[PDB]
C-alpha cells in the first residue's frame, strides 16, 4: 500500500514578481506561454507545453 | 527559466533595477525493516526480499534488497551466538 | 512462466518454486528443509539498456524446522513502512499556519509492507487416514470453485464419485435436485 | 419430464426418510404412511399436480430397496442421508 | 503451453512457456482416487485518486473519486489412480469399459 498527497499555488504579474514551483508538474511558463500564444494565435497551438 | 524555483520581484524606476532572490527547500526520508525467521541451531538459514537486476560484467544476475542471514548457536541454558550479516540495498 | 535472459542465453523460471524434504522422527514430529520463492516480473519502467530487460521481483526462504503433526507454524516474516517528505517555501513566509499556508508547496508520500510465512504438515498412515485428507481437502477446492458461478461439472462431479469410494448415487442425486 | 421428475424427487425423500427411521435410529420420524403424506404435502406446497399416493408408495419402495442393496457402508449412508433429508424433516414437523 | 499475447521478446528468443511441473513418490491402494498436488490463490489490487478534501460525502461526493479495481482467482488440483490387472479376464473389463468411456 502507498499513500501520497501534494499541494501548492503559484502567482504571476507583469509588473510584479514570479512564484514558481517545478515539482508541481507545471511552471507559470506554461501559463504565460499558454495564453499569449493562445490569444496571439487565437487558439491552441501544439507548441505549448506537452506536459 | 524552465528550471528556476522561488520568487523574484520586478522593479523599475528610471535608470535602475533590482532583483531579489531566495528560496527554502527541505527533504525528509525514513525507512524501517523488521524481518524474522526460525531454524535449527547448526544449519544456517538465509532470507532476502527485493528485486534483481543485471549489470554488464555478457552480464550476470544481481540482487538488491534485504539479505539477512545468520547462524545460531545455543550454548548455556539461555544464551546464543549470531554470526549475522546483511544489507539493505 | 519461463523467460530467457541473455547470459547466447538460457532458460529462466519465474513463479512459486516450493521444494522440501520431510523426515518423520517421533510418533508425531517432522523435519522440513524447505526452500521457495514467489517471483514475478513487473517492468512498469526499469533499467533495460537494450541488453537484458528484467526485474525479477523475488522473495526467497530456506531453513529447517521441527514441527508437530497437525500444527500451524510461523516460519518467516517481514513488516515495513517507508515515508518521505518534500517541502519548499519562500523564506520568512508561510509562517502563519492559517494564513501563510498560501506559500508552502508540499509533497508527501508513504509506503507500508508486510510479509508472512506459514507451514503445516499432516502425517498419513494408511487408507483410512487418507480418505479424510483427500476428500476434505478436495471439498476445500470445490468451496471456492462453486463459490461464485453455479455451473454443473462433468469432471468435478465424476471425480467426487471417485473420492466417495450405484443406487445411493441415484437417491442422493434426486434429493439434491429437489433442493434447488 | 413433466410428471416423472416430481414423482422421483418425492419418492427419493420418502424412501430416504424411511431408511433413516428404520436403519439409522431416527425414531423421531413418524410412520411410513405419515412420511408418504409429508412427501405429498411438499409437492402440494410447490403447486405440483396431484401426485397419486399409491404411485408414490410403489416408486418409494423401489428406491428404498436400492438404498438397502447398495454396497455403501451403513455409517456413510446414514450420515449422507441425515444431511440430505434435513430440510425435508423440517417440513414434515 | 505458450501464450504470447504480449511478452518480453527482444528480437532474441520469443517465448513464455507457461508451465506447471510436479514430481514425487507415493504409496497407493489398487482402486483409489488420490489427491497428489494442489494450488488455490486469489490476487486483488486497487487504484484510487481524488481531489483532496472532496469526494468525502459518499452519496454526493462520489463525483470526484476515480476508481480502478480488479481481482484474479486461481486453483489447481492433481489426482492419480492406478488399477492392477492380473490376467485376461481382468483385462477385458478394463479395456472394454474404458473404451466405452
Numbering used by the authors:
A (entry chain B): 354 to 404
B (entry chain A): 405 to 461, 474 to 505
C (entry chain B): 455 to 461, 474 to 631, 638 to 652
D (entry chain R): 39 to 131
E (entry chain C): 506 to 606
Paper text:
The protein GspD forms a 15-fold rotationally symmetric pore termed the secretin that inserts into the outer membrane (OM) and provides a conduit for substrate into the external environment. The T2SS from the human pathogen K. pneumoniae HS11286 strain comprises 13 genes in a single unidirectional operon termed PulC through to PulO. Note that Pul and Gsp nomenclature relate to equivalent proteins in homologous T2SS systems. In this study, the T2SS outer membrane components PulD and PulS are co-purified with the core components of the IM AP including PulC, PulE, PulL, PulM and PulN.
Focused refinement of the OMC yielded a reconstruction with an overall resolution of 4.3 Å. All domains of PulD were resolved with sufficient map quality to build a complete model of the monomer and the secretin, excluding the amino acids (aa) in loops 288–303, 462–470 and 632–637. The N1, N2 and N3 domains pack tightly with a diagonal offset of 36°. N0 is positioned almost directly below the N1 domain and does not maintain the diagonal offset. The N0 and N1 domains are connected by loop 7, which constitutes a substantial 26 aa linker. The N-terminus of loop 7 forms a wedge that packs between neighbouring N1 domains. The N0 domains form a tightly packed ring with alternating stacked β-sheets sandwiched between helices 2 and 4. Importantly, each PulC HR domain binds to only a single PulD N0 domain and has no contact with neighbouring PulC HR domains. Overall, the binding of the PulC HR domain to the PulD N0 domain appears to be important for the correct positioning of the N0 domain within the secretin and the subsequent stabilisation of the N1 and N2 domains. Loop 38 between S-domain helix 14 and helix 15 bound to PulS constitutes the lone contact point between the secretin core and PulS.
